[PDB]
Design a protein around this ligand. Structure first.
Ligand SMILES: CC1(C)CC(=O)c2c(nc3nn(-c4ccccc4)c(O)c3c2-c2ccccc2Cl)C1
Ligand SMILES: CC1(C)CC(=O)c2c(nc3nn(-c4ccccc4)c(O)c3c2-c2ccccc2Cl)C1
Ligand SMILES: CC1(C)CC(=O)c2c(nc3nn(-c4ccccc4)c(O)c3c2-c2ccccc2Cl)C1
Ligand SMILES: [Mg+2]
Ligand SMILES: [Mg+2]
Lengths: 339, 337, 335
């Protein structure tokens, strides 16, 4: 945990200005930081405020340095340096340590080295957990699923059967990976279940938020690429494919057989329909209503934002009657054209 | 479980064309299928492609049969036949087998024949589980709740107290049935909890997806009809009634005391207001904003879909100022007339 | 079971009829039978009170002439209903006593009359106040503190360093304290920002099922006293919610949003972050909140449902509204 400021600077590739023997115990916001804390400045408007910050050290740029009133770590990119130093000084505990006597683990499960399984977690037959995997308390990992080295599940995560998860993933509590996709045939109004015998394949370095659901495929697989980040409360339907490094913010709903490219950014509460493709490098702003394929990179948006309710009532009434407005406009144009 | 093609054809009521002794081990998509697999063709444009499919048998229609390049099962409805053969050849495991020594089962719980309960599940007093019920690992089933024969819960499902679930239901993980409805009275700005002492009644053959919540009623009950299918991440508020055979796709949010008729279809991410009714045979397309009662069957839609952001900025600004556009149109009409 | 006269006294209601009637429970007007008390708020029900079979009806003074049973007269029947339903509550507790299958770290501190349900897992450093009840299968992470009288239903997840006040209630499937969605970006690769802030939940907070409230990045996510939050809500890192605000089901809130006191956020609304909503704001259902709200009142958005045939035309015309605007401008110029 605690680290000499000089050592922290070397690991951050930062230029130290000040006492390298200062001991840093943790990261804090500029407002909250006290002795022993390191903090960071990304906004030069706070230069005049640094004498009010009581951090032992502040990460800043070269242009900021003349304004320091503390030991300073000078870097090109304070925000990225903050992320790195917060990892070095991370106080987040592990989901579990060692193997809980109350865990229920099938004799055929294969564990790598340094695996931890929390209290009352349930591990099915054929499961493989790679080196350094951590399964939180209360999880379920279904038959024959494989979790790659370094991956970690927080408490009360559910992995169904035949799921593959790569290395260095992180899954937050309440998430369900591998439930049945929403597949039914129809025999005269009677829904006939289509067994969902595809899988979910999750790549390396994937982070998934809490209470997110990712359904298994109907025959072929649901696929989440490497480096993807998914927020809370998302729904990823059967046979969705998400390309490497795409980010999906909270509450996004994706319908079946959607394909999303690489380096996409899907804003919170968006709705993305299925059986279509979104190309690489597309940004959908929050609450976007995606009805058609997207074939060019760029930023796309939908939605009519808030108005005072009395105003909204009129806006909505006029929009709902916009066909009459169109007809009146055309009628007027004809009269002005002398026809 | 492997099966002879002629035996499979018989169970499917299909006309066999080819070798009945072929052993089928599984179902596969047309592109993935290998020897031992059965697959199906629903799209006649793939007739010319059948010689590229390595399945041991293909389900198809009588019109497709001249194009077969394999043993064929001829049926009227290949898609329905696929559903049925996938059931016959299902590889999905059961949520549990036998009764786990780590399950915690109240002495007063009543278990039927051939009930399986997974590791660390918790069964309260007065619970009744019918024959062949399977409770996944980590589940909670609350006091006096009843689960009908053949119904199955995947892992980590929560059923509260006094819940009734019918026969042959299936509930996916993370789902919560019977939490308090959102009932509060207001006392000078402070919320006063209204205990929710109604229940949830779930019919037979209901399928519920993952991380869905169905709240119990305030006084009378939340009711899910028979044959209803509900996708993931849905919110079904207190005292909602959903008619038989209705389908609710993922992410739908329903407010309290909504009544939906039979054979409705509610598209994903729709939002439905409360204290009102939707009649039978209504379809709401995805993201529908349902504010008012629906009294006639048919298809209903809302929402302005995506545009390039530069375009959207103008669309949104113009719509928000549409009253001014309307006034100008009226003024121009008066001036011209 | 309670004598009507006693129930009326506890509700500060004026009794009209036989005080010795024994009330066993609350029921809706349509379902009520002998032994039940019910209530009416809508005067449409006056004509058919002869058909209500309750033993007593909570009503107003103006309703009293239509009464066909013992009546409790009050100013506010709905609020009185809430109070009498609490007196007559049949809801069981999430747990009774400490289950032998619960796994409780030796360093956890438990107050008086704490109950812990089967297979719950209590981490090191946890503090549970007097009369706290933890449901079956819950997880409560390291050093979290839950204040007296608070209750978790089954399968609730509380992460580490979380603080929950007194008399709270959290429904099943809810997750409090997961990582906020915080990442830096290094040449297209996401770089996790550890989320080492917390969640602070006040007193008398109720949280619905499968709701998620993320911990803050450095400073905290804060839920005020008396806040009620429905199912399937997302409260992002460093959101702050003022006292007595209500959040209906399926609301998604983005990071660093500040919501004032006495707000009402309608179901399925979407509230963007790094902005503030003042006190006494109502956002009706499905509201798309993109800008700060600085004046109290009611706000709304969205183009509602139409028959599909009509919607197709509405949507096409709105998407082309810039062309309509240009055509109107051109016509004004010509005229
Ligand atoms: C991943 C990141 C580090 C960067 C990022 O772009 C991002 C983040 N949080 C975000 N929350 N909501 C959000 C909006 C409304 C409600 C709830 C959440 C976004 O829409 C986010 C977005 C974002 C914004 C627009 C388009 C696409 C994205 Cl993904 C954090
Ligand atoms: C049940 C079925 C076999 C048939 C079906 O109609 C269906 C299905 N999946 C569906 N996903 N989304 C969906 C759309 C957007 C986001 C998430 C999911 C529908 O809206 C579906 C619908 C559907 C479409 C329109 C109206 C009502 C419904 Cl129920 C699969
Ligand atoms: C808290 C309360 C006792 C009172 C209340 O105002 C309320 C309640 N439940 C509500 N469900 N949905 C809801 C709407 C659509 C889908 C799902 C749920 C509201 O939008 C509610 C609202 C409400 C209505 C208008 C504006 C803001 C709010 Cl909060 C119950
Ligand atoms: Mg146990
Ligand atoms: Mg939603």
């Amino acid at each position: 945990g605690s680290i000499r400021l000089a050592d922290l600077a070397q690991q951050l590739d930062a230029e130290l200005h000040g006492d390298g023997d200062i001991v840093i115990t943790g990261v804090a916001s500029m407002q909250s930081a006290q002795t022993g804390h390191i903090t960071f400045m990304v906004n030069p408007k706070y230069r005049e405020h640094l004498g009010l910050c009581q951090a032992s050290a502040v990460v800043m740029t070269q242009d900021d340095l003349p304004f320091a009133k503390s030991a300073a770590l000078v870097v090109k990119n304070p925000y990225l340096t903050y992320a790195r130093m917060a990892q070095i000084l991370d106080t987040t505990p592990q989901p579990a340590q060692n193997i809980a006597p109350s865990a229920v683990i099938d004799a055929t499960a294969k564990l790598g080295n340094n695996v931890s399984i929390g209290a009352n977690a349930v591990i099915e037959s054929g499961v493989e957990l790679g080196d350094n995997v951590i399964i939180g308390a209360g999880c379920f990992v279904g038959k024959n699923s494989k979790i790659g080295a370094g991956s970690r599940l927080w408490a009360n995560v559910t992995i169904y059967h035949e799921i593959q998860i790569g290395q260095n993933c992180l899954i937050q509590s309440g998430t369900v990976v591998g439930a049945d996709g929403f597949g039914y045939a129809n025999d005269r109004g009677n829904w006939v279940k289509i067994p969902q015998i595809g899988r979910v394949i999750i790549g390396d370095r994937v982070e998934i938020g809490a209470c997110t659901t990712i359904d298994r495929g109907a025959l072929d697989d649901t696929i989440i690429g490497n480096g993807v980040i998914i927020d809370n409360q998302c729904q990823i339907a059967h046979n969705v494919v998400i390309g490497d490094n795409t980010a999906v913010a909270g509450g996004v709903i994706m319908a079946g057989s959607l394909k999303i490219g690489r380096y996409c950014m899907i804003g919170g509460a968006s709705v993305i329909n299925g059986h279509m493709e979104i190309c690489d490098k597309v940004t959908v702003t929050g609450m976007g209503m995606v009805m058609r394929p997207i074939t060019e990179p760029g930023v796309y948006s939908s939605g009519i934002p808030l108005q005072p309710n009395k105003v909204w009532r009129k806006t909505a009434a006029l929009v709902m009657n916009i066909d009459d407005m169109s007809k009146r406009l055309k009628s007027l144009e004809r009269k002005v054209n002398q026809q």
